């Protein structure tokens, strides 16, 4: 397995054309604020190919 290739799976809005989103802030999926701390309704936005 080669898992060095990553991709964005969680985002608040669709990218505009030819946009480069490099932000790695933890995505919030619930009312409770995340504040950069992982937990319920706080998912890391990156996922690997493998």
């Amino acid at each position, epitope marked *: 397995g080669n*898992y060095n290739y*990553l991709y964005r799976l969680f985002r608040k809005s669709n990218l505009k054309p030819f946009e480069r989103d490099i932000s*790695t802030e933890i995505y919030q999926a619930g009312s409770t604020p995340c504040n*950069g*701390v*992982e*937990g319920f309704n706080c998912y*890391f936005p*990156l996922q*690997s190919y493998g």
Partner: nanobody
Amino acid sequence: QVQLVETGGGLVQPGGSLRLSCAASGFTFSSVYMNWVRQAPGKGPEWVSRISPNSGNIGYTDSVKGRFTISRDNAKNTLYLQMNNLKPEDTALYYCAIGLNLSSSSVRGQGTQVTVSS
């Protein structure tokens, strides 16, 4: 481009607890926690151990109870795994993955395979 550079692990004979390092870079590490997870030849991967960012509670399979320990350092931004009473059955790839609650098929690095040599 987040790179989970993992330090190689040489062959270690039984008699001394093995110390292994695994580094991360390219993103804020104090926010999310890191996870140790093992894949052995001839079988699929399985989660080994996890450490919380703030609470710092080490959680790992009871089958590996009393012999695996973790130590995270944000100043150096890396994880260290210590195994005591290492047995041949430990031979596998103890790779690293950015720990999510499920920690299933999440992001991971190449890692290094280590086999205990009698």
